[PDB]
């Protein structure tokens, strides 16, 4: 295993720039850095990323990011669902997703 969650931060945070200035899990809920991150690996994944000012905006960024990664290569079983992250129900599932995404990015 690459790590668990510590590496997840330094990894993606570096890609975009934002150092998740808040909760690690909650920060992902709004969906911004992750969406910006995938665009790096998979072209045009979430280019039209909406600012998480409102509420439905987050749902959009999360949906595009997950749908893109699920098909991109990462298995759904190893991917948090839009509702899980948004509702913040699944915590381990959220981090586990990034772990799998790492293997894909590395191969590419």
From Swiss-Prot:
<feature type="domain" description="Calponin-homology (CH)">
    <location>
        <begin position="2"/>
        <end position="105"/>
    </location>
</feature>
<protein>
    <recommendedName>
        <fullName>Calponin-1</fullName>
    </recommendedName>
</protein>
<comment type="similarity">
    <text>Belongs to the calponin family.</text>
</comment>
<comment type="function">
    <text>Thin filament-associated protein that is implicated in the regulation and modulation of smooth muscle contraction. It is capable of binding to actin, calmodulin and tropomyosin. The interaction of calponin with actin inhibits the actomyosin Mg-ATPase activity.</text>
</comment>
